[PDB]
Amino acid sequence: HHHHSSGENLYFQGIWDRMRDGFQLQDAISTNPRIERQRLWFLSNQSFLEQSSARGSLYMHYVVERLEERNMPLELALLPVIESAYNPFALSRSNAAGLWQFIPATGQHFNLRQTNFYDGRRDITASTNAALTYLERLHDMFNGDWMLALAAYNAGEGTVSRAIERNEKLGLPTDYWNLPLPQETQDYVPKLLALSQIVMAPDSYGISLNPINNEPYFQAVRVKRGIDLSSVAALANLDEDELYQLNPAYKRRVTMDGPQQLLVPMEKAAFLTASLDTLKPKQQYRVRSGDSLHSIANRYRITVAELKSANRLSSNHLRKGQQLSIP
Ligand SMILES: CC(=O)N[C@H]1[C@H](O[C@H]2C[C@@H](C(=O)NCCS(=O)(=O)O)[NH2+][C@@H]2CO)O[C@H](CO)[C@@H](OS(=O)(=O)O)[C@@H]1O
Ligand SMILES: [Zn+2]
Ligand SMILES: [Zn+2]
Ligand SMILES: [Zn+2]
Ligand SMILES: [Zn+2]
Ligand SMILES: [Zn+2]
Ligand SMILES: [Zn+2]
Ligand SMILES: [Zn+2]
Numbered sequence: 236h237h238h239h240s241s242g243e244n245l246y247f248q249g250i251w252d253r254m255r256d257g258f259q260l261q262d263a264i265s266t267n268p269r270i271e272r273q274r275l276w277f278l279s280n281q282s283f284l285e286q287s288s289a290r291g292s293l294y295m296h297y298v299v300e301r302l303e304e305r306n307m308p309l310e311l312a313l314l315p316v317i318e319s320a321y322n323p324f325a326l327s328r329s330n331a332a333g334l335w336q337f338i339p340a341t342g343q344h345f346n347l348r349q350t351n352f353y354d355g356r357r358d359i360t361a362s363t364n365a366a367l368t369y370l371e372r373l374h375d376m377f378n379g380d381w382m383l384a385l386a387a388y389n390a391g392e393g394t395v396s397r398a399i400e401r402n403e404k405l406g407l408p409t410d411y412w413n414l415p416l417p418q419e420t421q422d423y424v425p426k427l428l429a430l431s432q433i434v435m436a437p438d439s440y441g442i443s444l445n446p447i448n449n450e451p452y453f454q455a456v457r458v459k460r461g462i463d464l465s466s467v468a469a470l471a472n473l474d475e476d477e478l479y480q481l482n483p484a485y486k487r488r489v490t491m492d493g494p495q496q497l498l499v500p501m502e503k504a505a506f507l508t509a510s511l512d513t514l515k516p517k518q519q520y521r522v523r524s525g526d527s528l529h530s531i532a533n534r535y536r537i538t539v540a541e542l543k544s545a546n547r548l549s550s551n552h553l554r555k556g557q558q559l560s561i562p
Contacts, residue, residue: 239303250295250447255435257302257309260381264428267412273422273429278440284316284430288445291321293452293480294334294359301363308381310431311370317426323357323483332356333483335366345369353492358484360455361494382411382424390420453481454504458497461516464488470510471503522557535561 239257247253264270277284288295298312318336319325331338333356337347345365347355355361370384376392377383387395398414407413411424437444458467464485468475479488481498490497499507520531528551532542543551545562553559 236306238306244449247449249444249449250292250299251434251437251444253449254295254299254309254312257299258431258435259308260310260428260431261435264432267425269412269421269425270429270432273426274432274440277430277433278442281442283320284433284442285445287316287320288447291316292445292447294321294323295447296449296451297359297453298334298363301367305367305371307367307371310427311367313427313430313434314366314385316430317423323359323362323480333362334359335362337362337365341369348492350492352487352489353484354486355484355493358493359481359498361484380411385424385427386411386414386416386420389423390416394420451501453498454501454508455496456499456504456507456511458490458495458511459514459516460490460495462490462511462514463517464490464497466514466517467497467499467507467511470514471499471507473500473503518561520559520561522553522555522559524555526553527551528553531559531561537562 236259237257243256244253247256294315295312298315299309302309302311315321315334318331319334321334323333325334325336326332327336329338332342332354335356337345337356339349342349342356342365345368347358347361347365349355355365370388373384373387373392374381377387377395383395383399394416395414398416399409402409402413433440433442434444464478464482465475465488467473468478475488477500478497479485481500484493485491497507497511520535522531528539528542532539535542541562542559545560
């Protein structure tokens with residue numbers, strides 16, 4: 236069972252090469268019609284993996300490193316593909332949320348808080364660490380069997396246990412493949428295995444995996460409560476959309492009820508690590524470049540005369556970063 240060394244890392248071409256290095260489930264796969272069936276779906280519908288991978292490039296490095304640190308099967312790095320298409324905003328009919336598709340009750344078990352301001356199930360780092368802990372615990376409950384653990388992740392430990400017991404009573408084997416599970420769960424395991432077979436040897440299937448570098452996409456940066464993502468976007472010259480995709484838990488795009496931390500693009504990490512205390516949870520107006528008394532007055536539906544009356548100006552000519560009281 237390979238334990239990964241970080242000294243291997245500089246030699247990987249991209250994320251897919253790195254991911255395969257940590258696969259643990261490939262040897263014990265075998266012919267089962269159910270796997271081939273899923274594989275054919277992927278081969279016939281290639282845009283699914285392609286679009287999942289594009290969205291995946293924000294998150295996949297993070298997931299791979301967490302799985303490597305715990306020596307867990309790197310095939311689980313593909314679980315968000317089949318769960319959510321690596322879309323943290325995905326919401327199932329069961330109200331499964333985030334990359335890992337936690338239902339409300341299971342989210343609550345793992346203390347992934349759900350408030351008007353914050354949904355921990357969408358939180359990339361919190362939901363990833365909870366999902367890996369849940370999968371490890373399920374693996375431990377089923378005597379180290381990853382197939383049953385995956386089945387239980389989808390259907391619940393209870394459903395899988397009762398199915399095992401029922402087979403025992405009937406005198407049938409109790410491995411995953413022999414349990415008569417709901418169709419979603421019957422498909423779940425072979426789907427992940429099929430996808431992992433393609434990722435393991437994509438050339439042999441005529442698949443081209445989306446190029447994704449073997450580099451971090453984001454860094455965690457300390458932030459105060461009550462900051463708007465728009466304010467951070469402006470400070471760092473970023474698209475608010477990118478920050479939201481990295482911090483999907485913050486339903487109202489303000490840092491409340493969460494980790495007091497923002498994931499930010501690597502290229503802005505140094506700047507924001509240095510800068511993020513200048514923003515303050517938020518009458519007063521900060522004069523921009525290109526502002527005049529007139530333009531400011533127009534924006535606030537007041538008159539220039541009222542605006543001058545409310546301040547103690549040496550001249551009409553404003554300076555960038557100057558503070559004005561708005562009447
Ligand atoms: C990660 C997670 O929350 N797993 C939970 C799982 O969700 C599944 C549900 C599924 C889902 O959303 N199905 C419907 C999809 S669709 O909207 O109908 O297409 N996706 C999730 C992860 O695989 O539902 C089962 C059963 O309730 C839960 O087991 S139990 O609570 O112990 O019984 C289990 O905890
Ligand atoms: Zn070991
Ligand atoms: Zn390795
Ligand atoms: Zn699901
Ligand atoms: Zn094991
Ligand atoms: Zn960028
Ligand atoms: Zn007025
Ligand atoms: Zn001047």
